[PDB]
Write a protein that binds this ligand. Structure first.
Ligand SMILES: Nc1nc2c(ncn2[C@@H]2O[C@H](COP(=O)(O)OP(=O)(O)NP(=O)(O)O)[C@@H](O)[C@H]2O)c(=O)[nH]1
Ligand SMILES: [Ca+2]
Ligand SMILES: [Mg+2]
Length: 164
């Protein structure tokens, strides 16, 4: 069937692994031993259509391996956490690097603000909505913990790949 290659990127500790596992296994894991991090495949139904998601959950930081997953990846979730200002400031660098390897300022992407279940917010929604608008991509707030917005974020990325 149709297979969509999705890649999850962003700074250390924003929730890349928890987000991926929440989508794949429908629960919240508190910690991961990066015995690779790596790749998962899932059959899902999106807009009536059944299809295959191949999701790579990346490390925060081999240049050729990084460039390699950026080049083969079809869509990207760019994750920060709403309680970590530094993670939001790093977003620019992840997006720039993807655009530079793919040779396109039109790569399918969704800006993800994770940990929205938390009280100690340091990044306002309006700031992140502005950044996303500046890139011309959607913004979605998520919580891997409560599952808020998780399906929306991944499913929106797939649609962005189709609408490309
Ligand atoms: N409150 C809350 N905590 C979360 C959420 N998502 C992840 N966490 C917690 O935040 C920490 C980071 O999660 P993790 O998935 O390991 O992050 P990561 O981005 O994969 N880190 P790394 O880049 O080092 O692989 C973990 O302690 C996890 O339990 C969320 O939505 N809400
Ligand atoms: Ca280039
Ligand atoms: Mg991880």
């Amino acid at each position: 069937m149709t297979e969509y290659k999705l890649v999850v990127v962003g700074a250390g500790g924003v929730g890349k692994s928890a987000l991926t596992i929440q989508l794949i296994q429908n629960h919240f894991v508190d910690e991961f031993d990066p015995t690779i991090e790596d790749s998962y495949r899932k059959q899902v139904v999106i807009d009536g259509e059944t299809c295959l998601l191949d999701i790579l959950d990346t490390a925060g930081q081999y240049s050729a391996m990084r460039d390699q997953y950026m080049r083969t990846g079809e869509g990207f979730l760019c994750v920060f956490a709403i309680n970590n200002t530094k993670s939001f400031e790093d977003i620019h660098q992840y997006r720039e690097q993807i655009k530079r390897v793919k040779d396109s300022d039109d790569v399918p992407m969704v800006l993800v603000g994770n940990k929205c279940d938390l009280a100690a917010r340091t990044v306002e929604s309006r700031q992140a909505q502005d950044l996303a608008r500046s890139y011309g991509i959607p913004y979605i707030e998520t919580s891997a913990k409560t599952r808020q917005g998780v399906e929306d974020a991944f499913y929106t990325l797939v649609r962005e790949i189709r609408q490309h």
